[PDB]
Design an enzyme around this catalytic site. Structure first.
Site: not given
Ligand SMILES: O=[N+]([O-])c1ccc([C@H]2CO2)cc1
Length: 318
Positions: A101, A232, A297
């Protein structure tokens, strides 16, 4: 767990919590949002057990690591700065790198700026963010999915924090961790609401114990979400600052691994980049791409042993 060592080190002007276990070649683990060093607990145990020095920090702004107040203290350069100082403190020339991530985005920057310090990179979830000279990172995202796409909603200072504060830290953490809905996370207007997961389970999935969720909550209750969100908020600034590397290639050997149900894999035209040639072209030594069926994820937690094996098998190659 007990044998997992915890210390605080001074790196790049901040105090950083480092969790460590094992001896041998260093494997440096970089967590993502909204996680902690704890995200790697199974990999720290496995890799240490298998003869490696497992190192997993809380990144700048997370957990027990210092959280600078300025939003601008959260560029990729600040974070890589922290990690380069850490690596020097470990007293090694090269590390094996494993990242997930936001940790993976920072990993890509580390590999961009200092390939010679990374022997091999196991990259989870987020592939290289290709720098398109014609459009800034977050602008492209807004064009595609509009204003309520999560990254967009993350940009304004204090707002997402208040919304998350309204539904509660535990709700937010469970909401995100449990998500298995593919595609772009788009929020309801003006609130957190169902956020990333309109179908939260009553009970946690089998890869996440109540004690796990409680650990996450116990730190986020303390730190809030500001530091992690700040990452972000620098994506466009990162796009500006990385101009000198426009059109560049990464030479570090890479193993990319993603869950098939990852919102990242299932959005932003990621499949086309990952599989259609672009990723391989930006990253010539991308050796393998693994998609994990029925995995969401958080693949290092959801498919822990499988990832442990993929990491072990990959780094032992070298
Ligand atoms: O919700 N999530 O599973 C999640 C967590 C963290 C990110 C980073 C790319 O932004 C996306 C999605």
């Amino acid at each position: 767990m007990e044998e997992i060592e915890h210390r605080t080190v001074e790196v790049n002007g901040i105090k950083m919590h480092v969790a460590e276990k094992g001896e041998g070649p260093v494997v440096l683990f970089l967590h993502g949002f909204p996680e902690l060093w704890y995200s790697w607990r199974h990999q720290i145990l496995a890799l240490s057990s298998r003869g490696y020095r497992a190192v997993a920090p809380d990144l700048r702004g997370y957990g027990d690591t210092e959280a600078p107040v300025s939003i601008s203290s959260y560029t990729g350069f600040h974070i890589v700065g922290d990690l380069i100082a850490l690596i020097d403190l470990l007293g090694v020339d090269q590390v094996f790198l494993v990242a997930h991530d936001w940790g993976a985005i920072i990993g890509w920057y580390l590999c961009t700026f200092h390939p010679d310090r990374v022997k091999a990179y196991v990259c989870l979830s987020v592939p290289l963010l290709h720098r398109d000279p014609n459009i800034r990172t977050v602008d492209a995202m807004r064009a595609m999915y509009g204003d309520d796409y999560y990254i967009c909603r993350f940009q304004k200072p204090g707002e997402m924090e208040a919304q998350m504060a309204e539904v509660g830290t535990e709700y937010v953490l469970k909401n995100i961790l449990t998500t298995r809905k593919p595609g772009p996370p788009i929020f309801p207007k003006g609130e957190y609401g169902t956020g990333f997961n309109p179908d939260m389970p009553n009970s946690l999935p089998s890869w996440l114990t109540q004690d796990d969720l409680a650990y996450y909550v116990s730190k986020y209750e303390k730190t809030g979400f500001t530091g992690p969100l700040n990452y972000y908020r620098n994506m466009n600034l990162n796009w500006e600052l990385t101009a000198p590397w426009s059109g560049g290639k990464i030479q570090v050997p890479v193993k990319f691994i993603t869950g098939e149900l990852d919102n990242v894999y299932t959005s932003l035209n990621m499949k086309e980049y990952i599989h259609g040639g672009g990723f391989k072209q930006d990253v010539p030594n991308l050796e393998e791409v693994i998609v994990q069926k029925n995995v969401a994820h958080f693949n290092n937690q959801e498919a822990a042993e499988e990832i442990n094996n993929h990491i072990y098998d990959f780094i032992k190659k070298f």
